[PDB]
Design a protein around this ligand. Structure first.
Ligand SMILES: Nc1nc(=O)n([C@@H]2CS[C@H](COP(=O)(O)OP(=O)(O)OP(=O)(O)O)O2)cc1F
Ligand SMILES: [Mn+2]
Ligand SMILES: [Mn+2]
Ligand SMILES: [Mn+2]
Ligand SMILES: [Mn+2]
Ligand SMILES: [Mn+2]
Ligand SMILES: [Mn+2]
Ligand code: NA
Ligand code: NA
Ligand code: NA
Ligand code: NA
Length: 327
DNA sequence: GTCGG
DNA sequence: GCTGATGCGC
DNA sequence: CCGACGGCGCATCAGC
């Protein structure tokens, strides 16, 4: 199935360990980068040397690849898997609301299992209460077929609140994925621009009023994080939904951001820094001589952003990650 | 952990 | 109130 | 203790 899959899984496992157990956020990103680059490499890897040529594979990862190529495993990962404290910390971070820091506190207080975690609800904040409540459903992927029915509801209900709203389903759906992990809804309204001043609320209560949104993780004036569910013919899993209100006049920088992937975005924002610019979901600005962002540059399309940084435009579908296959 | 300066 | 970290997530 | 690594919304606490 997956060309070099053994290696990329290995590197993914290490990344997760550095993040969740070591709290080494930059080592985590080194391994992710490594995993991404190898996955998109179109040849089989014969050695750590070969791999090392790829940007973001260095000495220590080559070594590991050698070890893995030679033995079909990695001793560093055997020791880690066996370490039950590492394994429970890792596990707890898969609940939404719990990161490396809380997962560690919980495990050092004898909370190690799903069963233990439910026993100690009173220890959890609201966000964690809800991620635990839907832990199972949130592990499932969303078929594009079901994404369409959700778009239909979201779009219809936005129009019914105020037809001047425009709602756009971004994330992995806009990239054409046949399944998505969540639903990312990007929202504009002409009253909200970068120079103006309860636009997101209305939409959320409307979506709750017709019982599509079922819970709330967090909510502010511009970003809503919650749970949703299709009505049953006769039940559908609950699902994560992200609703983002961005300023009407910065739609392109915002839709670029909200389309992802995550890895595409940090690579893009990294390539810009070396060219001399800084990008966020609102603007692309030139970095001053002192690394200080200057005034925003004009953007009339997604391609204008790529253009400023001397990148070839890439349609949404080519902003996903890929892997390659062996026979 | 990698890169680069 | 304000600012500024830290934790968490996308 | 070579240093930067993407960038920021929401929740919370700390120090003023
Ligand atoms: N680290 C991240 N940086 C980003 O810019 N993003 C952006 C913000 S919103 C857009 C989509 O994020 P999601 O986490 O919903 O990821 P996705 O839709 O690509 O993937 P999925 O199908 O939701 O698993 O990507 C996400 C990150 F995780
Ligand atoms: Mn495949
Ligand atoms: Mn294989
Ligand atoms: Mn490739
Ligand atoms: Mn205890
Ligand atoms: Mn998504
Ligand atoms: Mn999302
Ligand atoms: Na390299
Ligand atoms: Na988590
Ligand atoms: Na308790
Ligand atoms: Na459920």
């Amino acid at each position: 199935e997956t060309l070099n899959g053994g290696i990329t899984d290995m590197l993914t496992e290490l990344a997760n360990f550095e993040k969740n157990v070591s709290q080494a956020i930059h080592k985590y990103n080194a391994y992710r980068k490594a995993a991404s680059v190898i996955a998109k490499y179109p040849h089989k890897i014969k050695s750590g040397a070969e791999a090392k040529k790829l940007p973001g594979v260095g000495t220590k990862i080559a070594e590991k690849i050698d070890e893995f190529l030679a033995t079909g495993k990695l001793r560093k990962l055997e020791k880690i898997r066996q370490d039950d404290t590492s394994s429970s910390i890792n596990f707890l971070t898969r609940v939404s609301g719990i990161g490396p820091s809380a997962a560690r506190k919980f495990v050092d207080e004898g909370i190690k299992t799903l069963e233990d975690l439910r026993k100690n609800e009173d220890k959890l904040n609201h966000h964690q209460r809800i991620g635990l409540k839907y832990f199972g459903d949130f592990e499932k992927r969303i078929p594009r077929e079901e994404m369409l029915q959700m778009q239909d509801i979201v779009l219809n209900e936005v129009k019914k609140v105020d037809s001047e709203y425009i709602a756009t389903v971004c994330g992995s759906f806009r990239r054409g994925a046949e399944s998505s992990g969540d639903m990312d809804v990007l929202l504009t309204h002409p009253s909200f621009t970068s120079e103006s001043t309860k636009l997101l609320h209305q939409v959320v209560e409307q979506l709750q009023k017709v019982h599509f949104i079922t819970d709330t993780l967090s909510k502010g004036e511009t970003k809503f994080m919650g749970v949703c569910q299709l009505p049953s013919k006769n039940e559908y899993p609950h699902r994560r939904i992200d609703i983002r209100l961005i300023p009407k006049d910065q739609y392109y920088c915002g839709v670029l951001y909200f389309t992802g992937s995550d890895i595409f975005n940090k690579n893009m924002r990294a390539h810009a820094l070396e060219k001399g610019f800084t990008i966020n979901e609102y603007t692309i600005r030139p970095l001053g001589v002192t690394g200080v962002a200057g005034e925003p540059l004009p953007v009339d399309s997604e391609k204008d952003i790529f253009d400023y940084i001397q990148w070839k435009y890439r349609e949404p579908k080519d902003r996903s990650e890929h892997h390659h296959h062996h026979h």
